[PDB]
Amino acid sequence: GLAQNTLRQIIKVSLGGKQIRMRFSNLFSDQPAVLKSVSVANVTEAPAVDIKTQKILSFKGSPQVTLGADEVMYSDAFDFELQPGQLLAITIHYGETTSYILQGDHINNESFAGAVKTDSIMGVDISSVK
């Protein structure tokens, strides 16, 4: 269980570009996942990020999205300073490879201090656009 919490995943991008898109797949299956808010930002150290580059994602215009079992869904296209070989952070707040869980909403939390570190949980990946 992890609903009503906030998970921040750190990934390794191998493709740079100006305009990117985010893949979302329900890895953790069974029940659906309600994504209250998603953000993408650059990584400084540890789980700490930088909001001055953070971008909040939208899904068909809506900032929230629900992902049933065996479902994949991409975010809307957003401008981002992506570089080949960079550290990327994706923070997701839910509602009823390193990864960091905090209780409650922590979309605007740089430090993520006091975070745990799990063993993934949700399939994320960068993807091209039109």
Numbering used by the authors: 41 to 136, 149 to 171, 175 to 185
What does the paper say about this structure?
The construct of FjoAcXE that successfully crystallized did not include the first 36 amino acids that comprise the CBM; residues 37–40 and residues 137–148 were also disordered in the structure. Due to the incomplete FjoAcXE CBM structure, further analysis will focus on the PbeAcXE and CspAcXE structures, although based on our analysis in subsequent sections, we expect that these regions would participate in the active site, i.e., Lys34 and Arg148 of FjoAcXE. Based on the protein sequence of FjoAcXE, the CBM-like domains do not clearly group with the existing CBM families. CBM-like domains share structural similarity to several types of β-structures, including CBM1 and CBM35. However, the CBM-like domains of FjoAcXE-like AcXEs do not clearly group with existing CBM families.
Acetyl xylan esterases (AcXE) that target mono- or doubly acetylated Xylp are well characterized; however, the previously studied AcXE from Flavobacterium johnsoniae (FjoAcXE) was the first to remove the acetyl group from 2-O-MeGlcpA-3-O-acetyl-substituted Xylp units, yet structural characteristics of these enzymes remain unspecified. In FjoAcXE and all studied homologs, the sequence motif around the catalytic serine is Gly-Asn-Ser-Ile (GNSI), which differs from other SGNH hydrolases.
